[PDB]
Scaffold this active site. Structure first.
Site, PDB file in Angstrom:
ATOM      1  CE  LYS A   1      -3.581  -1.865   2.836  1.00  0.00           C
ATOM      2  NZ  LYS A   1      -4.632  -2.407   3.430  1.00  0.00           N
TER       3      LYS A   1
ATOM      4  CG  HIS B   1       2.542  -8.894  17.605  1.00  0.00           C
ATOM      5  ND1 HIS B   1       2.475  -9.683  16.114  1.00  0.00           N
ATOM      6  CD2 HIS B   1       4.080  -9.425  17.798  1.00  0.00           C
ATOM      7  CE1 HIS B   1       3.225  -9.180  16.233  1.00  0.00           C
ATOM      8  NE2 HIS B   1       4.705  -9.537  16.222  1.00  0.00           N
TER       9      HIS B   1
END
Lengths: 112, 76, 111, 113, 76, 74
Positions: D65, D99
């Site tokens: 992206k 995470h």
């Protein structure tokens, strides 16, 4: 400094879905006429909610980068890359969706 | 029978997502590996594919530990 | 390069709530006195926890941006818009909250 | 003359990664470079193993992206200071991963020259 | 001793169970006003035992529906 | 020496919810125990209480494995 500010936003898609269900008006309050076309063109309701959610986050992220929703148009270029035109800055955007969360990331670079 | 053990272990580790160090022959599925009946159904079905054998619930219900699953393979 | 590094952190607010509930001195360990003024002024408990989780996500993002190697209670994040002061860099910050998650992102630009 | 080329971000559900990994182990070789595959194989705790994989996937997705060829050709490693990074002639790629128990995310910012 | 025991019971409720300070009043109902259940009530009671170095059998914990019930027992 | 190790293991086991078998001197909190900075932060504060001591983040961040935490208390 070459950067003016950065912005990020995470929001729950089930909350956008809920508001849109009880208030169709939400759309005209968050999206530009431009974005409204795109939203109305999708035939998959899930995808519409993702789009709305993604746009709301972007406008919150953009707004945080600076310091009106309808006046912040986020469009997709020929590659389908999200952009925002805002005189006095170079805007970089990026969005990501999951089944329950949508997030946008914005960075504003001074142009002068 | 070391072969069948490792093959059963492989299924438990990379297909059920259980740590390899927990997979010993005396390990209980429900108590030690956190694997429920659905997971045991997955193990059993995967063992049918890897050996071309059919395992009815009558013998799948008899497996509560790793050694049970292993033992059963060695019987074929 | 002009940018030293970037960082982002995502934390479950409930984990902050759990730890804070069992260990009160977590505030003096993560928040600086300046930040403690803001924390002690909230009367709505979910807000206190939300703010605590956010500063933690920020402090974690800042450490990743800098590149490990900086104590939590020596990184004062203040508003103006969130920002941090660390000689040598121009620290940019942004925070976001949901009911269960808090995230922050830090971009360290070179002086 | 902008300093940055593009920024990218990606959020992904750990369990979706674990699920695909468990039905198609082939996912490893398709997503990780050989260098990354070795580090992945060094871990013994499946949870950490899946986080790592989820983190890389996100990073490379966000990298795409940002860039505006192939996942297993893009090596994400940790630099001198322990910050994730990728090499790509013409840019300095800055990466960060985070995470939780159910989500892995990554942001990418490409400066140019 | 008077209002001190209340303060101590309030602190626990606020800082441990996460309920707003302004909602904690003698007349407050754990299940209906503070959103606390048997588990939270259990928590509250265990912290009080450490707090005052005493025993609060489960027999008595089920009697307290309000914050005022908690304070009273401590007074005894 | 190897006496503090047990007091450290109990916290990791009873407080953080990690299995006893996994708690070895060389076990890495982030690679082997699924323990993030927050969990470590807890361990550290729990230790401060059980050993009338103080542990700055500087010395907290240095912790990577279970052994670092014990060899620290020693």
């Amino acid at each position: 400094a070459m950067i003016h500010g950065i912005g990020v936003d995470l929001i729950e898609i089930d909350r956008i879905q809920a508001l849109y269900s009880k208030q169709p008006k939400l759309v005209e309050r968050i999206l530009t006429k431009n974005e409204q076309h795109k939203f109305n063109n999708f035939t998959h309701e899930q995808r519409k909610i993702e789009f709305l959610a993604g746009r709301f986050a972007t406008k919150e992220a953009f707004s945080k980068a600076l310091g009106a929703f309808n006046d912040i148009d986020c469009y997709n270029d020929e590659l389908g890359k999200p952009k925002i035109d805002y005189e006095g800055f170079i805007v970089h955007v990026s969005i990501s969706h999951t089944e329950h969360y949508a997030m946008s990331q914005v960075v504003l670079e001074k142009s002068a | 029978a070391m072969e069948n053990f490792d093959k059963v272990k492989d299924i438990i580790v990379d297909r059920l997502g259980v740590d390899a160090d927990k997979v010993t022959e005396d390990a209980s599925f429900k108590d030690d590996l956190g694997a429920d009946s659905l997971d045991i159904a997955e193990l059993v079905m995967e063992l049918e594919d890897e050996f071309g054998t059919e395992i009815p619930d009558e013998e799948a219900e008899k497996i509560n530990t790793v050694g049970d699953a292993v033992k059963f393979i060695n019987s074929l």
